[PDB]
Design a protein around this ligand. Structure first.
Ligand SMILES: CCS(=O)(=O)c1ccc(CC(=O)Nc2cc(-c3cc(C#N)ccc3OC)cs2)cc1
Ligand code: NA
Lengths: 12, 252
């Protein structure tokens, strides 16, 4: 699912 | 995609040293000067007793939250690290899932006072007895021992920056799709770290660094202890543990 890591990596 | 995915010249290695040290300075969570200044601020016997009287689950939740906050700074460090954002998302996640806790454990030696065997936790310094309610004494003692051993090396902030960049960019992590790209980035980061040690007359620490399986053992013990806790308090984990912590240590 990797819900949080994907979001942190995509947030600029 | 990135200069550091190919062979780098000496000038490019010098730039990499500066870049890594800058990325670390901007993401280091707490300032070293603040941690050193706070060494005299120690939990009293009454405060220690208060932590010891906390329930196992309340203490696990507090520690999971503190660990998650530290991990968030490691994610930012990774994003600012030369070449990391040029890797594919699968590999960025593989590297962070395996390495984020390892980076935290290394960073933690800055918050550990080897003079009195105390660690900075929730505003003050306290000994390993502060964590007695967790019921994972072996893991806590192993983490204190690791911080003690790293503290004996007298790392500078720049050494921690370069060493933690290497802990994270590990081409041997299971699951990497673009293994060769990671191998090259790792080689250049190894050169940057060793160049800095050479330039500062600190090559003597190379033989004194922890063996690679040491960090792996600590991380494996953490995941095992979490599984034991989860069996005891499954709804605490489901309802009150940080989502990022669950994503990293209990498969979501
Ligand atoms: C890491 C980046 S930092 O800027 O150096 C920084 C930022 C914030 C803090 C406070 C904090 O969260 N302390 C904590 C300590 C522990 C802990 C430490 C040992 C040890 N030896 C053992 C068990 C432990 O828990 C069971 C968990 S949480 C410290 C440092
Ligand atoms: Na220290």
């Amino acid at each position: 699912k990797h819900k949080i890591l994907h979001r942190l990596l995509q947030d600029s | 995609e990135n200069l550091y995915f190919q062979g780098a010249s000496l000038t490019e290695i010098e730039h990499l040293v500066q870049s890594v040290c800058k990325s670390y300075r901007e993401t280091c969570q707490l300032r070293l000067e603040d941690l050193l200044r706070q060494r005299s601020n120690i939990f009293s016997r009454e405060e220690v007793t208060g932590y010891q009287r906390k329930s196992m689950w309340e203490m696990w939740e507090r520690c999971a939250h503190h660990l998650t906050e530290a991990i968030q700074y490691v994610v930012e460090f990774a994003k600012r690290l030369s070449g990391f954002m040029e890797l594919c998302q699968n590999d960025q996640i593989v590297l962070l899932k395996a390495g984020a806790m390892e980076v935290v454990l290394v960073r933690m030696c800055r918050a550990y006072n080897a003079d009195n065997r105390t660690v900075f936790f929730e505003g003050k310094y306290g000994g390993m007895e502060l964590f007695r309610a967790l019921g994972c004494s072996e893991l806590i003692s192993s983490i204190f021992d690791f911080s003690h051993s790293l503290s004996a090396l007298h790392f500078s902030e720049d050494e921690i920056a370069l060493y933690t960049a290497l802990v994270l960019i590990n081409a041997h992590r299971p699951g990497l799709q673009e293994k060769r790209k990671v191998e090259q980035l790792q080689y250049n980061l190894e050169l940057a770290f060793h160049h800095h040690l050479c330039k500062t007359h600190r090559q003597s620490i190379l033989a004194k660094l922890p063996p690679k399986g040491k960090l792996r053992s600590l991380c494996s013990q953490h995941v095992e202890r979490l599984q034991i806790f989860q069996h005891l308090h499954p709804i605490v984990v489901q309802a009150a543990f940080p989502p990022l912590y669950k994503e990293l240590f209990s498969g979501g």
